[PDB]
């Protein structure tokens, strides 16, 4: 899609909802879920706390704090995945992922791993216990961790794991592994370094499903590959798997996740269109003193090999359902009209989640078959319509709830007339006038929006 | 997708197949089908003949000649749709569409109508009889008739009817009706003027299915709207409906046809990307002497209103699964290489059909879940892989069978190792070196390609 302008974002104020801030100054609140007890459960990524919030009183209880979660103040690591077992009344399990020290690493510079872990909820003591590591030794870094964890209708865990930030910023010269897949020898050794930029599908005990797709002759936990930072993952009522993903300077994506698909990253951003992005592989640069011009690969410094999207030899490439947004090669990624933090005007929205709106007895008019996609950078939540079979999007991503907030997650109440949203505690967001602020209106908040 | 170069088309010679001409004396052969008698049935668009060819021996019989078919030598009209009833042994019906004079028209700029008609096949005399008009008074013109007629798994007729060529060439100043839908009064009066640029879904008697979608508050025969020239329509084994469509100077499309969808034409070519196309509505130019610069709306003469794709207020807009091809605004539609016909270098392929390859006992390796899309202008048949659920394309459209021929239709044998192709009698095609020829290697032929 074509970017919206600052004025188009500014007017999306959702006057048809009442806003009530339930809590603020949460410590990097990250995921929220409607609990089996009809309370709001949310995670604090930085502290590893799992909080249960009564939405009417805002009363909070720290149900559990995941011990030894590792979080860096300037990082996206910490407590990430969070899901309830779908049959919680008979299987009172919570599944998480998080960043933990990796004792198998003596290197003090990539010191952590990601672990997918199950806890058991004890209703008598109202806490979590009996941890079981389901899958350990997963990559970890400060960037592009993703970590959305959902349980599918097939009773498998689906887990997004980002590309770790390779090929940008602090990890510029590390080779991006989104396209790489494990050999059998690596699987035998539990060497999961290729589990970057993937959607994994795991049995509930963490084992590899025998019916997972094959990539390069090997079935692993990988379900799909070629992702950058896939923070959103949600099943539709008819069993399809929708996803949102953050692109680089362009081409955030809404994807339909299909078994064995290749979502193209880093070779392809968005559509395979050679439009506004090319793959500049800094790990293959002539030397490490080269600078990233940060022009999305369209213009690069000498010495970094660039591959057009159309030059990539890909297999099973799956294009996005929708890009937020796609631009042409003439696009100026250094456009100063937004101010001197030019990225704010980049044709992206930084989607942080993806939520399938299920309606209910108070369903919001017109919202059938919608996907809600919060935006960190634009301070909106997008509503994306699909057809009733969830086979295509209809029309464009409609912005809602414009504010100076980095929206991090969204759910709806069972009745469907109330949305609950998390916001980041700190960061930059685009103001109504298009410029950047790091003054967030509701830092680290749980907000409810009630349809009038 | 990004256009292939002439060199990339030239190399797609399919040396792994043996070519044999079965019939070489056909006049404007248009559709071909594998019939319920395991013979190949094909139509001749201008003569109205329906021929049956024995695939083993190549003997051919004219089964029927549809009387009073109207065809213009400079036109795409004539005998178009052609399908068998799916339970032919018990319901020996053939369904056609064709151009016939409209005695309710009293001028000869648009003197004809399209009629969807059923015939009963008489096996004892090997002919068609008992014509029944199922839907008459449909639009007709010389351009963009489409007319693919298939019977879906739901036992309904699906019929593509193009946009009649409005807003280009001889029909430049007629308002394109692809977005227009009938009022209840028009519909009740059998006024089908809005049945342009549509996929229709009809009951087998021509009536309106009670579960057809609604557009603008009216349930009509329209199933989808917003099409330009949808020449290909084919159901997949799991009941999805794939389509190919000719775009203007760009953005031929492979579409997934979803009930009630709006495929965007003429406001949107391909993706809603504002890239390489804009909608210049010549019918809205006050000055009817204005010239069409034929730069895809990106460059226009003074006096024609232009709407960007992103400026359209659309409902239920469904983007294509694949474009052949999309280019940026900097693209030069007058780039020399094709001579006085710079339009053969246009980033399109002119798809003429869409065929779901079903494999079989001798299925071609790697062709699982492919859609075969013949190209008129490039003299290739594209192979487009989809995932096993036919939810997305995988990778790119792979050209095959490069020759100086305008490929008009394709089917495969039941075992899957033979492809049968029709070629146009006349027209332009791109040569290996990228230039244009109107010397076709196999004018008006039925050809078979057998995997080696
Ligand atoms: O403008 C853009 O494209 C853009 C903007 C942001 C933004 O939010 O400011 C981000 C981002 N996402 C997270 C996150 O926690 O998900 C953190 C950051 C960050 O830059 O600090 C990204 C990206 O990571 O791709 N792209
Ligand atoms: O280069 C392009 O875009 C292009 C090329 C052709 C071509 O075949 O040469 C056509 C076309 N299609 C048919 C048909 O029978 O379907 C007839 C013609 C014609 O030009 O006479 C179209 C189009 O009608 O969009 N576009
Ligand atoms: Ca980004
Ligand atoms: Ca992608
Ligand atoms: Ca791209
Ligand atoms: Ca065309
Ligand atoms: Ca379209
Ligand atoms: Ca377009
Ligand atoms: Li590796
Ligand atoms: Li009308």
* Whether A144 is catalytic: yes
Position of tokens 């040396």? B15
CA of B396 to the centre of ligand 5 (A): 14
* B112 touches B105 (CB < 8 A): yes
> Would you tell me how many other CB atoms lie within 10 Å of the CB of residue B315?
15
Per this entry, what is the length of chain A? 452
Backbone angles phi, psi at A9, to 5 degrees: -65, -40
Per this entry, what is the length of chain B? 452
- Decide if A258 touches B, using CB distance below 8 A: yes
**Residue A169 is encoded by which pair of tokens?**
């910023």
- Distances in whole angstroms, Cα of residue B151 to Cα of each of B201, B234, B409, B414: 9, 9, 18, 19
* A371 touches A354 (CB < 8 A): yes
CA of B331 to the centre of ligand 2 (A): 19
Cβ–Cβ pairs < 8 A, chains A and B: 96
Position of tokens 């590959």? A225
Which DSSP state fits B404?
S
Q: Which helix (H) or strand (E) element contains residue A185?
A: helix A184-188
CB burial string A267-276: b at 16+ within 10 A, e below: bbbbbbbbbb
* B372 touches B386 (CB < 8 A): no
* B375 touches B369 (CB < 8 A): no
Q: CA torsion angle for B231, B236, B239, B243 (degrees, to 10)?
A: -20
Nearest CA to A249 out of A219, A284, A204, A280 is that of A280
Q: Which helix (H) or strand (E) element contains residue A138?
A: strand A127-138
> Would you tell me how many other CB atoms lie within 10 Å of the CB of residue B416?
17
Which DSSP state fits B325?
-
Omega prior to A266 cis, within 30 of 0: yes
Task: Classify burial at B217, counting beta carbons within 10 Å of its beta carbon; exposed 0-12, middle 13-18, buried 19 or more.
Answer: exposed
**Residue B392 is encoded by which pair of tokens?**
């997305």
Determination technique for this PDB entry?
A: X-ray
**Residue B59 is encoded by which pair of tokens?**
């003997």
Q: Does ligand 2 lie within 6 Å of residue B428's CB atom?
A: yes
In the sheet that A446-451 helps form, which strands lie side by side, from edge to edge? Answer: A17-23, A446-451, A418-423, A407-412
Backbone angles phi, psi at B24, to 5 degrees: -125, 5
Resolution value in angstroms: 1.2
In the sheet that A370-374 helps form, which strands lie side by side, from edge to edge? Answer: A355-356, A370-374, A381-386, A393-400
Backbone angles phi, psi at A188, to 5 degrees: -60, -35
Task: Classify burial at B410, counting beta carbons within 10 Å of its beta carbon; exposed 0-12, middle 13-18, buried 19 or more.
Answer: buried
- Distances in whole angstroms, Cα of residue B147 to Cα of each of A219, B95, B231, B233, B407: 45, 11, 7, 10, 17
* B166 touches B176 (CB < 8 A): yes
Which DSSP state fits A9?
H
Separate counts of helices (H) and strands (E) for chain B: 2, 30
Q: Does ligand 1 lie within 6 Å of residue A228's CB atom?
A: no
d(CA A261, CA A263): 6
CA of A246 to the centre of ligand 5 (A): 13
Backbone angles phi, psi at A311, to 5 degrees: -90, -10
Helix (H, G, I), strand (E, B) or coil at A316: coil
- Decide if A312 touches B, using CB distance below 8 A: no
Whether B261 sits inside 8 A of A326 (CB atoms) is: no
Position of tokens 């095609």? B429
- Decide if B370 touches A, using CB distance below 8 A: no
- Ligand 6 ion local residues (Cβ < 5 A): B 246, 348
Whether B317 sits inside 8 A of A394 (CB atoms) is: yes
Dihedral sign for Cα A71, A76, A77, A79, please.
Answer: positive
d(CA B24, CA B60): 12
- Taken in order of first residue, the domains within chain B and their CATH numbers are 1-450 (2.120.10.30)
CA of B271 to the centre of ligand 7 (A): 7
- Decide if A391 touches B, using CB distance below 8 A: yes
* B431 touches B376 (CB < 8 A): no
Backbone angles phi, psi at B283, to 5 degrees: -60, -20
Backbone angles phi, psi at B282, to 5 degrees: -70, -30
A223: left (phi over 0), alpha (psi -120 to 50) or beta: alpha
User: A-chain residues within 8 Å CB-CB of B254?
Assistant: none
Return all residues near B367 (Cβ < 8 A) that are at least 6 apart. B357, B359, B383, B416
d(CA A362, CA B272): 33
d(CA A54, CA A379): 25
Return all residues near B256 (Cβ < 8 A) that are at least 6 apart. A391, A392, B240, B241, B242, B243, B318, B321, B390
Active-site pick, A144, A180, A221, A227: A144
Which DSSP state fits A309?
G
d(CA A106, CA B104): 87
**Residue A218 is encoded by which pair of tokens?**
């090997």
Nearest CA to B154 out of B100, B204, B102 is that of B204
- Distances in whole angstroms, Cα of residue A375 to Cα of each of A133, A322, A403, B45, B342: 32, 15, 11, 54, 44
Q: Tell me the best of A246, A270, A331, A408 to mutate to test the pocket of ligand 1, counting ligand atoms within 8 Å of each CB and taking the most.
A: A246
C-alpha A130, offset from chain centre: 28
Backbone angles phi, psi at B293, to 5 degrees: -70, -15
Q: CA torsion angle for A230, A235, A236, A238 (degrees, to 10)?
A: 130
Dihedral sign for Cα A287, A343, A74, A181, please.
Answer: negative
User: B-chain residues within 8 Å CB-CB of A387?
Assistant: 258-261, 316, 318
What is the DSSP code string of A39-96?
A: SEEEEETTT-EEEEE-TTT--EEEEEE-TT----TTSS-SEEEEEE-TTTTTS-EEEE
Please name the residue ranges forming H helices in B110-222. Answer: 184-188
Q: Which helix (H) or strand (E) element contains residue B161?
A: strand B157-161
**Residue B241 is encoded by which pair of tokens?**
């409906």
> Which long-range contacts (C-beta less than 8 Å, at least 24 apart) are formed by B108-116?
B110/B139, B110/B140, B110/B141, B112/B70, B112/B77, B112/B140, B112/B141, B113/B137, B113/B138, B113/B139, B113/B140, B114/B80, B114/B138, B114/B139, B114/B140, B114/B145, B114/B147, B114/B161, B116/B81, B116/B149, B116/B157, B116/B159, B116/B202, B116/B206
């Amino acid at each position: 899609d074509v970017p919206l302008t600052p004025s188009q974002f500014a007017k999306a104020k959702s006057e048809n909802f009442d806003k009530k801030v339930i809590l603020s100054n949460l410590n990097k609140p990250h995921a929220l879920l409607w609990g089996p007890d009809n309370q709001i459960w949310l995670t604090e990524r930085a502290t590893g706390k799992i909080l249960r919030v009564n939405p009417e009183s805002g009363s909070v209880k720290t149900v559990f704090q995941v011990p030894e979660i590792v979080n860096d103040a300037d990082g996206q690591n910490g407590l990430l995945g969070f899901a309830f077992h779908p049959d919680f009344k008979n299987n009172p399990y919570i599944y998480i992922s998080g960043t933990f020290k990796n004792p198998k690493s003596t290197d003090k510079e990539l010191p952590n791993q990601t672990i997918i872990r199950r806890y058991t909820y004890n209703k008598s003591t109202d806490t979590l216990e009996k941890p079981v590591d389901l899958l350990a030794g997963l990559p970890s870094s400060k960037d592009h961790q993703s970590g959305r964890l959902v349980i599918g209708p097939d009773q498998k865990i689906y887990y997004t794991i980002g590309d770790q930030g390779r090929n940008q910023l602090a990890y510029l010269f590390l080779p991006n592994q989104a396209q790489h897949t494990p050999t059998q020898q690596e699987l035998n050794g539990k060497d999961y370094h290729t589990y970057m930029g993937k959607v994994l599908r795991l049995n509930l005990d963490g084992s590899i499903p025998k019916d997972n797709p094959s990539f390069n002759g090997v079935v692993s936990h990988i379900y799909t590959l070629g992702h950058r930072n896939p923070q959103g993952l949600a099943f539709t009522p008819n069993g399809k798997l929708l996803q949102s993903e953050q692109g680089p300077n362009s081409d955030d994506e809404i994807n339909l996740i299909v078994k064995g698909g290749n979502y193209g990253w880093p070779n392809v951003a968005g559509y395979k269109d050679d439009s506004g992005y090319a793959y500049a592989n800094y790990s293959a640069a002539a030397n490490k003193s080269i600078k990233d011009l940060a022009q999305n690969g369209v213009k690069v410094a000498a010495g970094v090999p660039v591959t057009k999207e159309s030059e990539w030899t890909g297999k099973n490439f799956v294009p996005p359902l929708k890009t937020l947004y796609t631009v042409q090669d003439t696009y100026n990624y250094n456009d100063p009209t937004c101010g001197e933090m030019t990225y704010i005007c980049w044709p992206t929205v930084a989607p942080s989640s993806a939520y399938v709106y299920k309606g209910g007895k108070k369903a919001i008019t017109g919202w059938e078959n919608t996907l809600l996609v919060p935006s960190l950078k634009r301070g909106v939540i997008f509503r994306i319509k699909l057809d009733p079979t969830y086979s295509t999007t209809y029309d464009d991503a409609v912005p809602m709830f414009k504010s100076n907030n980095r929206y991090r997650d969204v759910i709806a109440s069972p009745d469907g007339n109330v949305l609950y949203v998390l916001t980041d505690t700190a960061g930059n967001v685009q103001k109504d006038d298009g410029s950047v602020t790091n003054t967030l209106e509701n830092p680290g908040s749980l907000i409810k929006f009630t349809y009038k």
